Amino acid sequence: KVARREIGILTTNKNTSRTHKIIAPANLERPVRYIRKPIDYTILDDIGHGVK
């Protein structure tokens, strides 16, 4: 115990951890279906000083 106390002074925690190579997200991205919708020139009207 005396010997270990003497060398303990010269030590500090070696912050090492262990994880997985790949960690998937909790919720995988949902496949969004394609739906055709016409060009709309009003979608920016509420951004900044818009003009209706």
């Binding site: 115990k1 270990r4 106390r5 060398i7 303990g8 002074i9 030590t11």
Partner: peptide, 8 residues
């Protein structure tokens, strides 16, 4: 997990 034997 601290090691008291090394004075921790």
């Amino acid at each position: 997990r601290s090691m008291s034997t090394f004075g921790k």
